[PDB]
Design an enzyme around this catalytic site. Structure first.
Site, mmCIF file in Angstrom:
data_model
loop_
_atom_site.group_PDB
_atom_site.id
_atom_site.type_symbol
_atom_site.label_atom_id
_atom_site.label_comp_id
_atom_site.label_asym_id
_atom_site.label_seq_id
_atom_site.Cartn_x
_atom_site.Cartn_y
_atom_site.Cartn_z
ATOM 1 N N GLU A 120 11.132 47.269 48.538
ATOM 2 C CA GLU A 120 11.943 46.364 47.704
ATOM 3 C C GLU A 120 12.554 45.179 48.497
ATOM 4 O O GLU A 120 13.763 44.931 48.436
ATOM 5 C CB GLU A 120 13.005 47.160 46.925
ATOM 6 C CG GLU A 120 12.673 48.482 46.350
ATOM 7 C CD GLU A 120 11.553 48.313 45.349
ATOM 8 O OE1 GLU A 120 11.655 47.411 44.489
ATOM 9 O OE2 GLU A 120 10.572 49.083 45.424
ATOM 10 N N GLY A 121 11.694 44.472 49.248
ATOM 11 C CA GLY A 121 12.055 43.241 50.006
ATOM 12 C C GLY A 121 13.159 43.305 51.069
ATOM 13 O O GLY A 121 13.714 42.271 51.463
ATOM 14 N N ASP A 123 14.428 63.402 54.913
ATOM 15 C CA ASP A 123 13.565 62.368 55.452
ATOM 16 C C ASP A 123 13.660 62.234 56.978
ATOM 17 O O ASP A 123 13.605 61.121 57.510
ATOM 18 C CB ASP A 123 13.861 61.028 54.759
ATOM 19 C CG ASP A 123 12.692 60.037 54.834
ATOM 20 O OD1 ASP A 123 11.551 60.463 55.060
ATOM 21 O OD2 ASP A 123 12.936 58.821 54.691
ATOM 22 N N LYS A 138 12.316 62.133 60.531
ATOM 23 C CA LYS A 138 11.061 61.738 61.127
ATOM 24 C C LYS A 138 11.396 60.854 62.321
ATOM 25 O O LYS A 138 12.542 60.346 62.428
ATOM 26 C CB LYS A 138 10.170 60.993 60.122
ATOM 27 C CG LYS A 138 10.819 59.760 59.500
ATOM 28 C CD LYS A 138 9.887 59.067 58.521
ATOM 29 C CE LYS A 138 10.641 57.967 57.784
ATOM 30 N NZ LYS A 138 9.796 57.205 56.831
ATOM 31 N N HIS A 175 10.733 57.793 63.127
ATOM 32 C CA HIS A 175 11.183 56.422 62.717
ATOM 33 C C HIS A 175 12.684 56.361 62.406
ATOM 34 O O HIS A 175 13.302 55.336 62.693
ATOM 35 C CB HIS A 175 10.370 55.861 61.531
ATOM 36 C CG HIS A 175 10.816 54.492 61.082
ATOM 37 N ND1 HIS A 175 11.805 54.302 60.138
ATOM 38 C CD2 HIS A 175 10.432 53.252 61.470
ATOM 39 C CE1 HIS A 175 11.998 53.008 59.953
ATOM 40 N NE2 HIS A 175 11.178 52.348 60.749
HETATM 41 O O1 U4N Z 1 20.970 54.646 58.255
HETATM 42 S S1 U4N Z 1 21.245 54.018 57.005
HETATM 43 O O2 U4N Z 1 21.148 54.741 55.795
HETATM 44 C C1 U4N Z 1 22.916 53.324 57.197
HETATM 45 C C2 U4N Z 1 23.641 52.963 55.880
HETATM 46 F F1 U4N Z 1 23.984 54.038 55.059
HETATM 47 F F2 U4N Z 1 24.812 52.314 56.216
HETATM 48 F F3 U4N Z 1 22.882 52.096 55.113
HETATM 49 N N1 U4N Z 1 20.201 52.787 56.788
HETATM 50 C C3 U4N Z 1 19.656 52.097 57.857
HETATM 51 C C4 U4N Z 1 18.608 52.672 58.566
HETATM 52 C C5 U4N Z 1 18.059 51.985 59.651
HETATM 53 C C6 U4N Z 1 18.517 50.732 60.024
HETATM 54 O O3 U4N Z 1 18.003 50.077 61.071
HETATM 55 C C7 U4N Z 1 16.712 49.840 61.341
HETATM 56 N N2 U4N Z 1 15.814 49.889 60.344
HETATM 57 C C8 U4N Z 1 14.523 49.678 60.546
HETATM 58 C C9 U4N Z 1 14.058 49.369 61.822
HETATM 59 C C10 U4N Z 1 14.954 49.303 62.894
HETATM 60 C C11 U4N Z 1 16.335 49.551 62.676
HETATM 61 C C12 U4N Z 1 17.294 49.471 63.824
HETATM 62 C C13 U4N Z 1 18.640 49.919 63.817
HETATM 63 C C14 U4N Z 1 19.408 49.769 64.953
HETATM 64 N N3 U4N Z 1 18.901 49.198 66.033
HETATM 65 C C15 U4N Z 1 17.634 48.786 66.047
HETATM 66 N N4 U4N Z 1 17.157 48.245 67.208
HETATM 67 C C16 U4N Z 1 15.752 47.849 67.371
HETATM 68 C C17 U4N Z 1 15.643 46.990 68.636
HETATM 69 C C18 U4N Z 1 14.175 46.614 68.894
HETATM 70 C C19 U4N Z 1 13.272 47.872 68.948
HETATM 71 N N5 U4N Z 1 13.474 48.684 67.726
HETATM 72 C C20 U4N Z 1 14.866 49.094 67.508
HETATM 73 N N6 U4N Z 1 16.869 48.907 64.971
HETATM 74 C C21 U4N Z 1 19.576 50.113 59.339
HETATM 75 C C22 U4N Z 1 20.082 48.826 59.726
HETATM 76 C C23 U4N Z 1 21.122 48.281 59.039
HETATM 77 C C24 U4N Z 1 21.687 48.961 57.961
HETATM 78 C C25 U4N Z 1 21.223 50.180 57.550
HETATM 79 C C26 U4N Z 1 20.160 50.812 58.236
#
Ligand code: U4N
Ligand code: U4N
EC number: 2.7.11.1
Lengths: 406, 392
Positions: free
Chosen positions: A22-23, A128, A130, A132
């Site tokens: 969803e973008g 979920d 994993k 990732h």
């Molecule tokens: O855990 S949640 O449920 C929290 C809630 F409830 F508050 F929403 N949702 C989220 C899950 C994951 C996220 O972050 C990421 N997503 C996808 C890919 C990477 C990352 C991520 C996160 C942190 N550092 C780095 N660094 C990179 C550097 C270069 C090498 N790869 C790692 N990457 C989130 C980011 C912002 C907000 C929510 C996220």
């Protein structure tokens, strides 16, 4: 340069860290002079985001659950900021980036499991888990790095007095990491906290094997889960560390969810024991069985399959200075697990009095000493740990085994 | 009426303290909200800047949000149940609270941060978490100093801290040759330890005379009974923590290793480890000589006369145990622990169960045994076997 500023959050739109359904886009940014990852959410996902953020707070925090910082909202989007991390566990394992970060695989799994135990203690099932969504932190001021659970999109808070949920309530998980009870033709039992233990078991093997999965390559993975067709052949069948890991992982990925250990149970497993603790267990066992009858249930259990554990005669499989030293006490039977453990305890207890050559071959206490034995008798800990479940209720052994509160 | 400044809201009627501190809300979390006047803006910026680096640790207060309007600045932190002052003056165990406080202090010191203003008002007690657990957290970063890398000392300043009573003498007296170091916090913590365990007394007396008594070195730890194990151990730690010579005060990590904090099981294991370590030692060697120095007083002349009759009877099997010997008392303890399951029911019953009641049998009867043994066995503190028990 490019910077977007939305309230207390700023980010660089050129610095994309990932993309979701969803973008959804994740950027590197800043919040309150801290480095953050910033997720931009579209209108369609505002209710979804509010639920997970509510849950990631409303809940007590823990070092191994990702820290949520700030939300902002403009005319078009919502922004969620979390701590910036060095890597995902997927990146860490896929790139074999061990020399860069330096985080030990057992410690990262301990940390992940501690975070999981925390969620389960709050009646939260993740659904979920994993590689990732396990994040690896940036080094702190002392260079220390830790694993943290992230991605609360499928998490369920079970109501008070509910111990299970419906497998049809939302998306089942990520293909290849989904417990068989979620997708099996027959719904014999409703999924519980043990769906995460299954997923975690796959993650453990993934980390320890440096990128393999118990249920095979991605194409056949979920179909193999449904069949129960696993292989743990990255784990050496005659290596202590691998024997111990296999014993745990097998239980974690068991097809019967009721046979999977709880997260707190997993944390108690010898997979996580220090070398000192492993030696203390052997000592405690040897003390406990010193005056035990050879025909009683404890010794009979300890000797059942015992010949394979001692490799028929354990005196063949120790170094010559130790062989020489053990001729003095001709009461040690090479065919006996009890007697090998007696010999270990005896040499630990009398270590300072042993000749220099014997101290040298054993190495120092406790670490090199215990490795002398576990390197030569790869089944000894695993076998003994299983056999001594008979004494698990006894106060002396409560540190080594898990007992659930109610 | 509720004031809203950005992400922070509060009702101005809901005052928690005084700069005014209100109960408020931030991101649907209950918080304490401090309102800062222009005069204090740089002071506020400095302390928040410093706190972002240490909050993080579970025993340092969590900082949430700052806001700034045309007239004021606002700082939001987690809402807590109480200060340690309120807690003591009015279900956490006192030793655990002090362990937690010390862990938070050790964390600050590990980042080269000296607090300089530790007192019961500045130790906050959390609201219970979802499992009912409460913890202590260090707060009030107004006087905290971040020392440069490799730097250990800092200057005395006139009015750091502003409020008397808990301040190490070298923070105030110009007569002190050496400038203050991180050990100012150990002094303050020492007074806090005594305050908590005594249920409100201070080593240097009532509030009016406290700081003058600190400068004189005139302290009293008379709430700690001199022939009670727990108090002997607490006194030995506290007297080092509040030492007039700052270089004799133990580091925060050293304090955390002290027997004051050991479980009963760990006390017992120390005794066992000591007895195993000295089993083949010569009676004329430095270890046993040190362990037997003052030893007759520790064993109360003859330890066999100061144990229960069932144990006396059981121990006469080994007629080579010397009643005047600390080493032999420790040998008896280790032997009976080791052979506990084989002891007659009457003997198991008098000793009590392992490890807790068993070790108390001995520490209740020989209140100096652990303190004495811990001191004597410093000779082995470098050895791997003793790593649980000493800091190096
Ligand atoms: O855990 S949640 O449920 C929290 C809630 F409830 F508050 F929403 N949702 C989220 C899950 C994951 C996220 O972050 C990421 N997503 C996808 C890919 C990477 C990352 C991520 C996160 C942190 N550092 C780095 N660094 C990179 C550097 C270069 C090498 N790869 C790692 N990457 C989130 C980011 C912002 C907000 C929510 C996220
Ligand atoms: O630690 S600091 O350096 C953080 C930095 F660096 F970010 F500024 N400064 C501050 C220090 C202390 C504060 O809090 C308080 N001050 C005075 C009185 C009470 C409280 C307080 C705090 C939390 N809960 C409760 N509850 C009451 C309930 C009823 C019974 N007594 C406990 N009270 C601060 C509050 C807001 C902001 C800063 C504070």
């Amino acid at each position: 340069t490019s910077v977007v500023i939305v309230g207390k959050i700023s980010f660089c739109p050129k610095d994309v860290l990932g993309h979701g359904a969803e973008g959804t886009i994740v950027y590197r940014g800043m919040f309150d002079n801290r480095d953050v990852a910033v997720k931009r959410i579209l209108p369609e996902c505002f209710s979804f985001a509010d639920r997970e953020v509510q849950l990631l707070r409303e809940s007590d925090e823990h070092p191994n659950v990702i820290r949520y910082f700030c939300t902002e909202k403009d005319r078009q989007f919502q922004y969620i900021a979390i701590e910036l991390c060095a890597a995902t566990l997927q990146e860490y394992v896929e790139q074999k980036d061990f020399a860069h970060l330096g985080l030990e695989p057992i410690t990262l799994l301990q940390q992940t499991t501690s975070g999981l135990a925390h969620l389960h203690s709050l009646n939260i099932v993740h659904r979920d888990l994993k590689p990732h969504n396990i994040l690896i932190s940036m080094p702190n001021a002392h260079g220390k790095i830790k694993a943290m659970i992230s991605d609360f999109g499928l998490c369920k808070k079970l109501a008070v007095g509910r111990h299970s949920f419906s497998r049809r309530s939302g998306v089942p998980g990520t293909e290849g990491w989904i417990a068989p009870e979620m997708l099996s033709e027959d719904c014999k039992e409703n999924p519980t906290y043990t769906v995460d233990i299954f997923s975690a078991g796959c993650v453990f093997y993934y980390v320890i094997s440096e990128g393999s999965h118990p249920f095979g390559k991605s194409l056949q993975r979920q179909a193999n889960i449904l069949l129960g067709a696993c292989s743990l052949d990255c784990l050496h069948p005659e290596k202590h560390e691998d024997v111990i890991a296999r014993e745990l992982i097998e239980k974690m990925i068991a097809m019967d969810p009721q046979k999977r250990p709880s997260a707190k149970h997993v944390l108690k497993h010898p997979f996580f024991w220090s070398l000192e603790k492993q030696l203390q267990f052997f000592q405690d066992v040897s003390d406990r069985i010193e005056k035990e009858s050879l025909d009683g249930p404890i010794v009979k259990q300890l000797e059942r399959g015992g010949r394979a554990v001692v490799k028929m005669d354990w005196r063949e499989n120790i170094t010559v200075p130790l062989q020489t030293d053990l001729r003095k006490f001709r009461t040690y039977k090479g065919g006996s697990v009890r007697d090998l453990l007696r010999a270990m305890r005896n040499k630990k207890h009398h270590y300072r009095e042993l000749p220099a050559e014997v101290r040298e071959t054993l190495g120092s206490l406790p670490d090199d000493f215990v490795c002398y034995f576990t390197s030569r008798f790869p089944h000894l800990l695993a076998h003994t740990y299983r056999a001594m479940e008979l004494c698990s209720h006894e106060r002396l052994f409560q540190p080594y085994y898990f007992h659930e509160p109610p």
